[PDB]
């Protein structure tokens, strides 16, 4: 029956086009959450860049500390030497 | 009319094909959403690491200040001894 | 006997049950060994959504059969 068959096919087209809309809406939501995640991943790249600078700072501070150790050992020797000489009188 | 159903026939197949295409794309974005979220797990580890690097810098600063005072003491002990001996 | 539950992830889980086991007993077993809550599980075999209250012999589920797990 052409009447029933064309009523049937018509209603399916409407269901399919409604689903197309529904699925596209779903995609719109996930595209939004994808973008938010991308922003959060931008912060991760900076977090990495930050921590690598913190290492550079630690080593600069280590280097400073080592230098004072070399200076302090110098003074301890100059002091020890001077004490021997002062016991020569 | 037969031709009028040629219309509906061709459109239904076109719409059903589009649904298939859109769902494949949807599956791909579900894939990247999950993959990205896995990578966001790493961020909690990066932050914790940055905090240990920060504490380490402060520990080394503290060490540097300590040794700085030790050297200043010795530099003082030297000045006294040279001043007295330089009388 | 043994059966196979096929997820849409490509993972196939094996279960040891009896045909007197209610469909609630098998969805509890699925949760116990993979964690998925029962309220999200929807089991299909022979193109039938399996009823909690029914048993495996209700649907004539014999050994080595394969069910289909869909999450909602």
């Amino acid at each position: 029956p052409d009447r029933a068959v064309l009523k049937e096919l018509s209603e399916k087209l409407e269901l399919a086009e409604k689903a197309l809309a529904s699925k596209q809406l779903q995609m719109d939501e996930m595209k939004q959450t994808i973008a938010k995640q991308e922003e959060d991943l931008e912060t991760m790249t900076i977090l990495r860049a930050q921590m690598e600078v913190y290492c550079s700072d630690f080593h600069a501070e280590r280097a400073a500390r080592e230098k004072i150790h070399e200076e302090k050992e110098q003074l301890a020797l100059q002091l020890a030497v001077l004490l021997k000489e002062n016991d020569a009188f | 009319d037969r031709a009028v159903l040629k219309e509906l026939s061709e459109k239904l197949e076109l719409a059903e094909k589009a649904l298939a295409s859109k769902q494949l794309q949807m599956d791909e974005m579900k894939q990247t959403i999950a993959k990205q979220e896995e990578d966001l797990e790493t961020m909690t580890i990066l932050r914790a690491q940055m905090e240990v690097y920060c504490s380490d810098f402060h520990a080394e600063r503290a060490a540097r200040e300590k040794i700085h005072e030790e050297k200043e003491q010795l530099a003082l002990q030297l000045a006294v001894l040279l001043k007295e001996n330089d009388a | 006997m043994q059966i196979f539950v096929k997820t849409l992830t490509g993972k196939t889980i094996t279960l040891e049950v009896e045909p007197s086991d209610t469909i609630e007993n098998v969805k509890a077993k699925i949760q116990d060994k993979e964690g998925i809550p029962p309220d999200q599980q929807r089991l299909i075999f022979a193109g039938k959504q399996l009823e909690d209250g029914r048993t495996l012999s209700d649907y004539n589920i014999q050994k080595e059969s394969t069910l289909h797990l869909v999450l909602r």
């Binding site: 049937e8 | 059903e16 649904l19 298939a20 769902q23 494949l24 | 849409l8 299909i44 289909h68």
Partner: peptide, 27 residues
């Protein structure tokens, strides 16, 4: 009338998405 290519679940001839996973018949 037709069985989904994903869950192998059977859907009605009029069904456009699978009633179970909500996937297109041709997916």
């Amino acid at each position: 009338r037709w069985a989904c290519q994903s869950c192998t679940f059977e859907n009605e001839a009029a069904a456009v998405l699978c009633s179970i996973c909500e996937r297109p018949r041709l997916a």
